[PDB]
Design a protein around this ligand. Structure first.
Ligand SMILES: CCCCCCCCOCCOCCOCCOCCOCCOCCO
Ligand SMILES: CCCCCCCCOCCOCCOCCOCCOCCOCCO
Ligand SMILES: [Fe+2]
Ligand SMILES: [Fe+2]
Ligand code: NA
Lengths: 503, 501
């Protein structure tokens, strides 16, 4: 949890417009940048929160800004360019808001936003900035130049895809989108023919929907070597409904949460009716197989009200006492472990199927064949969210693991970095006053023997008058002890997701 | 949690018949018994697990044995006598099982008071969960008389966990014919007229039932100055059969929570709902602004946990005990927060605006209030059970500390302290040592909540030790202060009290 209040209101600088750079800046290093840290921290976020006198209203509306911290021989540069999306280009052309964003209607067929402010991921030799629509934007990871807009609907049958695709070691990309059903998209690795892997995209498996005409909002999903896990939440999209995307969301009060598993290799939906209490879910932490059970670690919000209702910029820009009051009635954040039994024996009807020796998670087989799940709580703090979770993904993604790293939210304000041991539930915290960090990204030491042998990288906004406005933070992944910072002389707004590109 | 396995199977001595004493034994003290500790630790449990060649089958079937550890000037005595119930007397007379027990059919409702003992006026009553409570002499352990609560108030039975206010007022709950309902019994304090307070018993409030003909099993309930809290679980009573044979699990209802205004004697029609669990022991309940804090020892699932407490299963070797518990409900300490002020304008939102909890209460359109708990403690088949607090000063009030018996696959093998604010735990544990419910005794001049000792009866069947002892831990850190060792075995005990003198 946080041990800090924010009366000075410095968090408002997260939601303030900035200018892009013409070329990279030098960043003043304090401490020692690891000499093995060679590559680029690439991150996406909103950078322009108004077009002249026309404001963007929601956190997910601001125009995509691509950030890069380059590391080489203990030296750091910072560069950023706005992504030349239809949304951005047409806004600069017409000097107004042209395309409707998540929570901001544009005034005068349907022009869906391509504002790729959320994440960036590799496909073959290419990198794509994304939002949660059918439009992803190919970007140059060295110059940050915008290359091309790609419409996924040209290639596969989905209305959109999440900003959280899973990426196997061979470069295979998995994603999910509604079409009502939910389709798993598989993009293969780059072949010897060297054609665009997106032109070889296919639907491998389909998940059914709880409502014939209303798909659940899906932000992320789980992947193991053998299984795909999809969590159907009571946050529903109502297509029937000057409207924006936010206006289409409603809460189903009665359904609670339905969990779904598919056989990855046999490409089959498994008709196991996993059920539990209502929660919002944005980020899966990790998923793995343990005997005949799937371990499903989730960042949950307890309730069926859409958490995005609390992320309007006008509310996030209020003074600290008003920010805390606004969050009082919001869903409570909680890290939960669910355990999904794969072998359901009818003889065990009415009993707990989770026979694993190291968990308090339960799965009750009911007479109607529904399997009622109770979680093991890994972390819980009052309006203290362990969010934007990251692991040692390359080596422990989809596999038994011990450690997760997170951004700590204090009434939705990011004010700390967190490490969670998911086996012992021990936590580590890094926190300084009037300092607002981003999602921590783990980079392994090249000679790593342990899971947490490496560093986490975070972009920190420090608007305190006796400090430079922002810096790149490097923590030791062992104990979250500071290793170095690279300070820059310009402000950096909020960033959501990113990756470390090794070179 | 426990850090111990039990391959030697010493826990079997918890479920072995013992003989009563004709007079108290001296107990060899190691360490120092506090000189302010003056009174009697009274505890109830099964003592006779067969009548000749006829066995009792269930943990809650053995014939009531009343235990007493007396403390005075740093010296300890141990005494025990079988309670002369109808069940016991008729069994000794006929040399067989006469009365049907919880999980043993006889080939007449049981009065086998093996569960708890509590004060009413100047008197002490051993109880089970029936209409029959047994007046006992707390000094000699002599059985005085049988009391039928049905003679006085409209209940089919009452729990072994009555709440007792500082003035001596006794509250209890039992199912009744309202169409089935649950009645709260109030027994007043002893008046100047000095007549039996049980003859002045009355029903103050009635809770409705989820099923017209099937009452939920109720083991305990919550009490605050202003409120009564009742948790209706999916474990239902469906009326050569015994009591166990009547229990079934309602798969669809989950858990219904109920509040009544204590002083205005009114049921409040707030439809609190959550996921299914078994509940035996409330830890504590208290009021915090317009919210009730409800701390519970829960078992996650709707299967009756009592299904796992047959003596044949509890007497198995350790590897078989652990395997038997694999598919059982998981124990978990949970904090629920019940909002008292429900505004329709907050429909679809979390009503729990308290700053120090992660517990939620969602107001639904059908006016159901869906609860999610804050988890205070969770360990794999490691139950924090038989909870105790500084009851006299913190019962029904804001509090920090709970003490518990730690169950390891249902085997008691440790003593636990829980800080319910920080979730920090303390453990006391020795190999091949099986303790009982810890009872907190305050230093008489204490201003702080945990300024005192906890008392536990420990079975230590290890060949290089005396068979049992009274354990005294410092309530601050559960560090050992003294033990009083006895040269005879003591079977399992459930509940009790410290009677100050
Ligand atoms: C530093 C960031 C923290 C401040 C905000 C608090 C976040 C609360 O946690 C919620 C986690 O949200 C998920 C993170 O990803 C954010 C981007 O995803 C939403 C993008 O939606 C735009 C798509 O809309 C068009 C599709 O219909
Ligand atoms: C030293 C303790 C070790 C016991 C191990 C098993 C305990 C599992 O936890 C469950 C707690 O059970 C409640 C504690 O109270 C015990 C007695 O309550 C049950 C009495 O039921 C008798 C009912 O008989 C009459 C039916 O109408
Ligand atoms: Fe996200
Ligand atoms: Fe009990
Ligand atoms: Na500090």
């Amino acid at each position: 949890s946080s041990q800090v209040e924010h009366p000075a209101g410095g968090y408002k600088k997260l939601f303030e417009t900035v200018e892009e750079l013409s070329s990279p800046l030098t960043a003043h290093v304090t401490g020692r940048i690891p000499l093995w840290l060679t590559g680029s921290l690439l991150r996406c976020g909103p950078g322009l929160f108004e077009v002249g006198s026309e404001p963007f209203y929601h956190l997910f509306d601001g125009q995509a800004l691509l950030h890069k911290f380059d590391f080489k021989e203990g030296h750091v540069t910072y560069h950023r360019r706005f992504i030349r999306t239809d949304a951005y280009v047409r806004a600069m052309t017409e000097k107004r808001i042209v395309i409707t964003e998540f929570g901001t209607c544009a005034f005068p067929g349907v022009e869906v936003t391509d504002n790729a402010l959320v994440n960036i991921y590799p496909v073959g030799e290419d990198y794509y900035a994304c939002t949660e629509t059918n439009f992803i934007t190919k970007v140059n990871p060295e110059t940050l130049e915008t290359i091309k807009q790609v419409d996924l609907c040209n290639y596969v049958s989905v209305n959109g895809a999440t900003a959280h695709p899973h990426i196997e070691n061979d470069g295979t990309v998995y994603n999910i989108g509604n079409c009502i059903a939910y389709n798993i998209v598989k993009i293969p690795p780059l072949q010897a023919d060297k054609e665009d892997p997106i032109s070889k995209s296919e639907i491998v498996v389909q998940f059914p929907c709880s409502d014939r005409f209303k798909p659940s909002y899906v932000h992320s999903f789980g992947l193991t070597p053998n299984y795909i896990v999809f969590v159907e939440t009571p946050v529903k999209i109502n297509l029937f409904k000057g409207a924006n995307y936010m206006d289409c969301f409603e809460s189903n009060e009665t359904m609670g949460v339905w969990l779904h598993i598919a056989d990855k290799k046999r490409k089959k939906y498994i008709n196991n009716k996993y059920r539990t209490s209502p929660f919002n879910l944005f980020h899966h932490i990790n998923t793995y197989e343990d005997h005949e059970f799937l371990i499903v670690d989730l960042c949950c919000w307890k309730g069926f009200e859409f958490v995005y209702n609390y992320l309007y910029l006008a509310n996030l820009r209020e003074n600290w006492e008003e920010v805390k009051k606004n969050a009082r009635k919001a869903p409570q954040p909680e890290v939960r472990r669910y355990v999904l039994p794969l072998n359901i024996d009818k003889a065990d009807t009415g009993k707990n199927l989770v026979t694993l020796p190291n968990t308090t998670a339960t799965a009750i087989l009911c007479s109607d064949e529904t399997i009622w799940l109770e979680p093991e709580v890994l972390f819980s703090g009052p309006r203290q969210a362990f969010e934007f979770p990251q692991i040692n993904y390359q080596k422990y993604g989809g596999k038994p693991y011990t450690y997760a790293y997170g951004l700590g939210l204090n009434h939705f304000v990011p004010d700390r970095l967190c490490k969670l041991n998911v086996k012992t539930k021990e936590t580590w915290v890094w926190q300084e006053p009037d300092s607002y960090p981003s999602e921590p990204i783990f980079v392994s030491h090249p000679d790593a023997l342990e899971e947490d042998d490496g560093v986490v990288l975070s972009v920190v906004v420090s608007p305190g008058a006796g400090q430079k406005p922002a810096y790149l933070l490097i923590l030791n992944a062992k104990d979250l002890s500071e290793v170095a910072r690279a300070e820059v002389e310009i402000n950096i707004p909020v960033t959501f997701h990113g990756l470390f590109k090794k070179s």
